[PDB]
Scaffold this active site. Structure first.
Site, PDB file in Angstrom:
ATOM      1  N   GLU A   8     -24.021  21.899 -31.581  1.00 10.89           N
ATOM      2  CA  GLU A   8     -23.609  23.292 -31.807  1.00 10.89           C
ATOM      3  C   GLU A   8     -24.696  24.074 -32.529  1.00 10.89           C
ATOM      4  O   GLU A   8     -24.430  24.928 -33.385  1.00 10.89           O
ATOM      5  CB  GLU A   8     -22.275  23.344 -32.552  1.00 10.89           C
ATOM      6  CG  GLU A   8     -21.166  22.693 -31.736  1.00 10.89           C
ATOM      7  CD  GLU A   8     -19.846  22.540 -32.466  1.00 10.89           C
ATOM      8  OE1 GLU A   8     -19.678  23.050 -33.588  1.00 10.89           O
ATOM      9  OE2 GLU A   8     -18.965  21.867 -31.897  1.00 10.89           O
ATOM     10  N   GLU A  10     -17.141  17.978 -26.740  1.00 13.48           N
ATOM     11  CA  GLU A  10     -15.944  18.156 -27.568  1.00 13.48           C
ATOM     12  C   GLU A  10     -15.031  19.111 -26.832  1.00 13.48           C
ATOM     13  O   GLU A  10     -15.498  20.022 -26.150  1.00 13.48           O
ATOM     14  CB  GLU A  10     -16.265  18.782 -28.927  1.00 13.48           C
ATOM     15  CG  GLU A  10     -17.032  17.900 -29.870  1.00 13.48           C
ATOM     16  CD  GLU A  10     -17.129  18.463 -31.287  1.00 13.48           C
ATOM     17  OE1 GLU A  10     -16.288  19.302 -31.692  1.00 13.48           O
ATOM     18  OE2 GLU A  10     -18.061  18.047 -32.001  1.00 13.48           O
TER      19      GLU A  10
END
Ligand SMILES: [Zn+2]
Length: 336
Positions: A167, A266
């Protein structure tokens, strides 16, 4: 064809697993591994999430995740934030028909400890990359402890989906952007330096040859490919996707264009549990994201076990669960 790990010295088992994963989308069924986050080592990690999933569906996730780094903790020494006690369960998971995955909520070495979501300047980031500074020594202490943990799995020939510095196009973790969707060419360069520093330390300095390297930008921010350190340092690309509408996730085309296997690294509902339907997620994979080789759903309120559609998700003809990747002691046949 044979798809090789980017590490030319990868263990045979890791070579076999990587090649097998890459060929999954050629199949007509049994082509997306299920996955669940198990928790943060010596904090929340346990088999409870796998057990919730098995209770709900009769099946266990093919991939089980642990995160070594508790970067929100203030500690006497920064590397105390690293705990590798989840290894025993990860090794057992591999012995019993699944694949381990490790991520890192790294503490922020610009600080004495903790501060994992406290942003830093490019000047501070440069100090972190410099092994001669107080900041650089803190980073290296963390990397050394992480490598010690990874080495335990390597001793037993256990392949690991290793997903560091995720991320990075988000503005929350210290290693990512400093402002929402704000391009910063220097930050992008520094991130690539950091990724390569970790790659070099684990692969070369520590000779860790059981790692499959996963690059995972956030689905809800720009610059998904700008941070890509390069084809020689990444095995699998993927999206960390928290959403309400499974059909409207951005980034699949951009990442698959990198010609690396793609995963939902995810996944979970953006808003409070209960109503989100995982049946729509597996259908969206089939209709919108067919190259997906695995998903890793988060635990807690994001789990399929506390949302709708766990059965549809786990029993879809496309889904592969724990044990189902094997025909006895060899992986199920590759389809070209
Ligand atoms: Zn092939």
């Amino acid at each position: 064809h044979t798809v090789s790990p980017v590490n030319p010295n990868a263990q045979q088992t890791t070579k076999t697993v990587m090649n097998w994963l890459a060929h999954l989308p050629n199949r007509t069924e049994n082509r997306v591994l299920s996955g669940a986050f198990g928790g943060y080592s010596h904090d929340t990690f346990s088999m409870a999430e796998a057990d919730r999933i098995r209770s709900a569906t009769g099946q266990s996730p093919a991939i089980y995740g642990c995160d070594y780094a508790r970067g929100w903790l203030e500690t006497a020494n920064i590397e105390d934030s690293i705990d590798v006690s989840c290894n025993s369960d990860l090794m057992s998971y591999w012995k019993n028909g699944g694949i381990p995955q490790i991520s890192l909520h790294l503490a922020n070495p610009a600080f004495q400890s903790g501060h994992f979501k406290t942003p830093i300047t490019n000047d501070q980031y440069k100090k972190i990359l410099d092994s001669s500074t107080a900041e650089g020594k803190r980073l290296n202490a963390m990397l050394s402890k992480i490598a010690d943990g990874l080495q335990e799995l390597e001793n037993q020939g256990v392949p690991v989906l290793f997903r560091p510095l995720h991320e990075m196009n988000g503005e929350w973790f210290w290693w990512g952007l400093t402002s929402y969707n704000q391009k910063d060419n220097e930050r992008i360069s520094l991130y690539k330096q950091l990724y390569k520093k970790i790659y070099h330390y684990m692969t070369d300095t520590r000779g860790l040859d059981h790692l499959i390297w996963v690059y995972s930008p956030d689905a809800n921010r720009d610059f998904k490919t700008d941070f890509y350190p390069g084809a020689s340092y990444v095995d699998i690309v993927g999206l960390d996707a928290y959403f309400q509408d499974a059909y409207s996730i951005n980034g699949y085309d951009q990442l698959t264009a990198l010609n690396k296997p793609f995963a939902f690294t995810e996944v979970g509902p953006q808003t409070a549990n209960g109503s989100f339907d995982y049946s729509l997620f597996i259908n969206a994979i089939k209709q919108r994201y067919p190259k997906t080789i695995y998903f890793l759903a988060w635990n807690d309120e994001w789990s399929p076990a506390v949302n709708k559609g766990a059965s549809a998700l786990y029993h879809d003809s496309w889904t592969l669960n724990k044990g189902e990747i094997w025909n006895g002691d060899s992986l199920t046949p590759i389809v070209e």
